[PDB]
Amino acid sequence: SVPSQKTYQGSYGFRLGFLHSGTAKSVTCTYSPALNKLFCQLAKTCPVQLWVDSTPPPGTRVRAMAIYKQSQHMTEVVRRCPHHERCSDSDGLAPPQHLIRVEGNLRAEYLDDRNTFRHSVVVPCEPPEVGSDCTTIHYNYMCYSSCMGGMNRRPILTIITLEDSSGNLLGRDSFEVRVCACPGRDRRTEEENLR
Ligand SMILES: *c1ncc(Cl)c(C(=O)O)n1
Ligand SMILES: [Zn+2]
């Protein structure tokens, strides 16, 4: 089984947004619109904006899940490598096997799917606060793209789904992720390679 990655704004006009962080050597998280790709350091804050055209119903949730991008690896569950899953970096909520965490949200729930065995993290969809036009979720990625026995240099996609209270699909967006030591440099390199 492979989760859909089809972009779907749905009834509420759901889509993601990203900050403009640049590509300086000091940057820890940066998004490339040209590549639709987030570059980030291990376990560092990744702000992801949620934008809607109209407010979805109370009980709407936002789920994140990783899959492998490449055709020949899409059926394999994305998980932390044998090193990082045994790290003592628990936050009290995320299972140690999960690549994607939500930072600083006590209502985050982590799912180990009983059928597909895939991991995901889900939070309530909060409306924007006063003085803001969007809401932001802070994600952390807990293994490097290069980790042996884990992602093993294989690119991943994060799929963000807007769901109703039963888990039915309301909206979908996605982006590639590279977890790496030098996200600014790697973004510059990959944007050059594309050009
Ligand atoms: C995971 N958790 C803790 C530590 Cl100290 C390490 C490491 O070997 O750097 N990994
Ligand atoms: Zn790892």
CA distance 155 to 179: 9
Distance 150 CA to ligand 1 centre (A): 16
Does 87 contact ligand 1 (Cβ within 6 A)? Answer: yes
Classify burial at 174, counting beta carbons within 10 Å of its beta carbon; exposed 0-12, middle 13-18, buried 19 or more: buried
Residue nearest to atom 9 of ligand 1 (CA): 87
- Between the alpha carbon of residue 6 and those of residues 13, 36, 135, 173, the distances in Å are 14, 14, 22, 7
Q: Which residue has the tokens 């940066």?
A: 30
Burial 7-34 (b: 16+ CB within 10 A, else e): eebbebebbbebeebebeeebebbbbee
Residue nearest to atom 7 of ligand 1 (CA): 87
- Name the phi and psi angles at 182, rounded to 5: -125, 70
Distance 88 CA to ligand 1 centre (A): 7
- Between the alpha carbon of residue 142 and those of residues 26, 75, 100, 123, the distances in Å are 20, 21, 6, 18
Number of structural domains the chain divides into: 1
DSSP 152: T
CA distance 62 to 33: 22
CA distance 35 to 26: 21
The experimental method, as deposited, was X-ray
- Looking from the CA of 103 toward its CB, the CA atoms found within 13 Å total 14
Resolution (A): 1.4
Does 82 contact ligand 1 (Cβ within 6 A)? Answer: no
Does 88 contact ligand 1 (Cβ within 6 A)? Answer: yes
Full domain range(s) for residue 192: 1-195
CA distance 96 to 60: 26
Distance 21 CA to ligand 2 centre (A): 25
Question: Which of ligand 1's atoms lies nearest the C-alpha of 88?
Answer: 2
SS3 174: strand
- Between the alpha carbon of residue 40 and those of residues 14, 91, 110, 149, 184, the distances in Å are 24, 19, 22, 20, 8
Distance 43 CA to ligand 1 centre (A): 12
Contact 96, 83 (CB under 8 A): no
Beta partners for residue 121, in sequence order: 64, 110
CATH code, domain carrying 191: 2.60.40.720
Q: Strand order of the sheet with strand 135-141?
A: 15-17, 46-51, 135-141, 100-102
